[PDB]
Design a protein. Structure first.
Lengths: 63, 86, 273, 131, 93
RNA sequence: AAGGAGGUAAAAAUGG
RNA sequence: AAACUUGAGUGCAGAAGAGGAAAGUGGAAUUCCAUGUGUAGCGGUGAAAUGCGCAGAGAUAUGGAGGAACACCAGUGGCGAAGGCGACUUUCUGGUCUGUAACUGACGCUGAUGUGCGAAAGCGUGGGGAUCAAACAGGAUUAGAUACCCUGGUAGUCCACGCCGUAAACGAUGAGUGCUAAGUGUUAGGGGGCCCCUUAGUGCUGCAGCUAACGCAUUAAGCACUCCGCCUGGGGAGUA
């Protein structure tokens, strides 16, 4: 399949882009696995770091 | 060291213009790197991983110095007195 | 910090001392000195009422500003000095109007640093503020019990307390002893921990050094006679030989509590040590 | 790192012969070229080409297979090595496979075969056995 | 070296008090040879979880560029001391 | 469909 | 003695990373303390009992104290010489890989003796102490049970600085170098048109060859060269 970030060409992920992060976050707030979301590993790392930043800044929930 | 400082050092010690691979240039840059890592370790004593790379650099500089001393004694003496590495 | 002597003699063997690297001036401020003759544990009747005090080196008293009531004016730490009258060191500070005072030297206070006191002071080591204005969680020392009386709590070397919470008229504090108690929020405290943290580690090493400190020898109860002590007498060595160990004056002295009842502070003391 | 180019060349030849390759390209040197020429003259290989390019040049050997696809080169063995060098006299020159094989030798009169060494009555460093 | 500093001010803050607080902390981030490239406010936003029992927070974003991090360190120290800022974070880039 | 690698539950009397 | 750029480094342009050190921030959860509601059980096991609880336990709600570890991401994935490294943020810092062809011109490999790092337990000094838990106490099982199981529980488990220097410290596989069919994944790149080629890793399958066999097989245990370490029947004994 194809990766959202690879297709859209975006080469950076901003932790304040809560709407985008909600795409890859689960219903309960867990980070969806790469094999499910289709994302590449390179951008999966960026996504995890951005999601944890947002959790710290309370933009996104933990649980 | 910063690439700017490295450029300054290579300009200072290059045998001729465009020379980046001379033993003098390599060992001067290695001296700068060794001093920087020593200054880092003085604060971060327990950084064994960094110190290992420091020792690799020291050995590389030692082998370059051995080669230079074997090839041209006068150049070796001049370089070591310039760098204060004896 | 701690210097370990070589065993050149059996007296020096295992002895240690402070290196005094923190001290930056080895003589005191003349105008802040007062005489301190020794009592040797003898009261106004001339009788020994506390044992084991006497002799020891002559000492001058350094007047110390425990009150820290000179507010809104900066003071610069001129020096850190030795003080024979207490475990902590003392910092001579010089106020911007030219008045000089000694304070307890906090851990980390450096020569040339600035300190201030008052409700508006910043929360940094050596500044003095009402507990009203000190945040929760801050480590403090030289804590007042009555506003304006001067610090009485957490003044020894390494001492500190922690602000825990703020009730209406009182602030909760955890003292070095582990006691948690209330203190009037108008009472002042100094930010930080008292310096000279290695004080307690010193191995005094020999009897003479205690004598220099003015401590006379402690004779154990069990090696006196019955008329001297409840533990006295018995042929040869003897065990305590009664239900509880006793003080020289005939009171039980192992586990027996002595804090008096019906004290005003009992409703301020939230948790004992 | 590399320590015996002659051993490397012999092992290249052996590996190519085992896999039944037709040609074999290796970095060149004068001793290697002389060895290859001796092999060709004796009939163990088919052809030898020298490519006079940069980087010391290249040798391109062409291996020889008989009828029934039988391998002409049965085996190559390094004799003298950097770790232990072997020399022999003219009267002590060894015969490989009772004479059915060659011993490549290095002599004051150039690197030759054991037959030529015995004929000229000279000895030298026994580089290799080929059979 | 650039830095993005995000902080949250308690929801129950008077307008003038919040204005003074934001001005003070922007000045702090500007002091130590650090140039405030741009400061903005994202308004009061719902928090994903209660912080100090607050369900809302005034979000302030600041971008400042400096050759060191003294201004950022002073900001963080004064934000820890402060009882008006609930959360803060500094990101290099 | 059959084999290889990681994690991971639930169960448990005793002696042959 | 004189040249060369292929090995080895350097410069230039790029890539990823739980590599390391120090400070700071954060959510979940456990334990404890206080208080409101509430009644007679809770807990535990194969089944039980010890134990806790009518002085109000357990449950439930709120707040506080404190220590420790970082759920999801997470992957034959990544990094490191090995040990090892997984919340986030900042500072300092090591190494590696890719392309280029200015630059040096063999400056390389190995490495006895030496000098450092080295899981866990353990030792010293000073802190800290939630959880778990040697020792230990009680209960159970049993012919007995110095155990497995249950209830507690100290060292320790955590931090700093020193010490110790060992593990099935393993790929039970020393380092360097070249050469020898193929198919198919994945990590980080590069070049030419989803395809092809290519570099460095990381897996699986599998020729030739090797092997006592099992199996290994471009990440060799094949073919070769250099250097180091090590072996020579089992016990005695890693003992004297
Ligand atoms: Mg006494
Ligand atoms: Mg007597
Ligand atoms: Mg009596
Ligand atoms: Mg008696
Ligand atoms: Mg007797
Ligand atoms: Mg340990
Ligand atoms: Mg147990
Ligand atoms: Mg061993
Ligand atoms: Mg082994
Ligand atoms: Mg590969």
């Amino acid at each position: 399949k194809v990766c959202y970030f690879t297709a859209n060409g975006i080469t950076h992920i901003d932790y304040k882009d809560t709407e985008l992060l909600k795409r890859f976050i689960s219903e309960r707030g867990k980070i969806l696995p790469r094999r499910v979301t289709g994302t590449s590993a390179k951008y999966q790392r960026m996504l995890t770091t951005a999601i944890k930043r947002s959790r710290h800044m309370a933009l996104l929930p933990y649980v | 060291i910063s690439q700017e400082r490295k450029n300054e050092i290579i300009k200072e010690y290059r045998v001729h213009e465009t020379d980046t691979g001379s033993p003098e240039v390599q060992i001067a840059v290695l001296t700068a790197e060794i001093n920087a890592v020593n200054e880092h370790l003085r604060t971060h004593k327990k950084d064994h991983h960094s110190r290992r790379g420091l020792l690799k650099m020291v050995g590389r500089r030692r082998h370059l110095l051995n080669y230079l001393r074997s090839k041209d004694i006068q150049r070796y003496r001049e370089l070591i007195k310039s760098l204060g590495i004896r | 910090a701690i210097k370990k002597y070589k065993p050149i003699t059996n007296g020096r063997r295992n002895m240690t001392s402070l290196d005094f690297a923190e001290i930056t001036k080895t003589t005191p401020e003349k105008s802040l000195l007062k005489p301190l003759p020794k009592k040797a544990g003898r009261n106004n009747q001339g009788k020994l009422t506390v044992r084991h005090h006497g002799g020891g080196h002559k000492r001058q008293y350094r007047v110390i500003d425990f009150k820290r009531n000179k507010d809104g004016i900066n003071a610069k730490v001129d020096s850190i000095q030795y003080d024979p009258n207490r475990s902590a060191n003392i910092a001579l500070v010089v106020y911007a109007d030219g008045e000089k005072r000694y304070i307890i030297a906090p851990k980390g206070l450096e020569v040339g640093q600035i300190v201030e006191s008052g409700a508006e002071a910043d929360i940094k080591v050596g500044n003095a503020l009402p507990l009203q204005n000190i945040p929760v969680g801050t480590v403090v020392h030289n804590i007042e019990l009555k506003p304006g009386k001067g610090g009485q709590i957490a003044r020894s070397a390494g001492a500190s307390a922690q602000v825990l919470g703020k009730e209406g008229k009182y602030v909760l504090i955890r003292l070095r002893s582990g006691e948690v108690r209330m203190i009037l929020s108008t009472c002042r405290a100094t930010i930080g921990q008292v310096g000279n943290l290695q004080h307690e580690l010193v191995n005094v090493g020999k009897a003479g050094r205690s004598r220099w400190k003015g401590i006379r020898p402690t004779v154990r109860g069990s090696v006196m006679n019955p008329n001297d002590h409840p533990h006295g007498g018995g042929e040869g060595r003897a065990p305590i030989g009664r239900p509880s160990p006793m003080s020289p004056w005939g009171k039980p002295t192992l586990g027996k509590k002595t804090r008096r009842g019906k004290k005003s502070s009992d409703k301020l003391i939230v948790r004992g040590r | 790192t590399m320590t015996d180019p002659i051993a490397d060349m012999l092992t290249r030849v052996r590996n190519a012969n085992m896999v039944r390759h037709e040609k074999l390209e290796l970095p060149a040197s004068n001793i290697k070229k002389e060895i290859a020429e001796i092999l060709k003259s004796e009939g163990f290989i088919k052809n030898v080409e020298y490519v006079e390019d940069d980087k010391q040049g290249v040798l391109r050997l062409f291996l020889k297979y008989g009828q029934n696809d039988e391998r002409v080169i049965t085996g190559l063995k390094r004799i003298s090595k950097p770790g232990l060098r072997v020399y022999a006299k003219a009267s002590e020159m060894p015969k490989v496979l009772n004479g059915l094989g060659i011993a490549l030798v290095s002599t004051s009169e150039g690197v030759i075969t054991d037959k030529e060494a015995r004929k000229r009555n000279v000895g030298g460093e026994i580089i290799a056995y080929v059979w | 070296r650039t830095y993005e500093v995000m902080y949250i001010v308690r929801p129950n803050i008077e307008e003038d008090a919040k204005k003074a607080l934001v001005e003070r902390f922007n000045g702090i981030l500007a002091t130590e040879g650090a140039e405030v490239l741009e400061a903005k406010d994202w308004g009061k936003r719902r928090l994903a979880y209660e912080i100090n029992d607050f369900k809302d927070g005034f979000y302030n974003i600041v971008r400042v560029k400096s050759d060191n991090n003294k201004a950022t360190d002073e900001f963080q120290r004064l934000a820890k001391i402060s009882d008006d800022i609930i959360r803060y974070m500094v990101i290099r880039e």
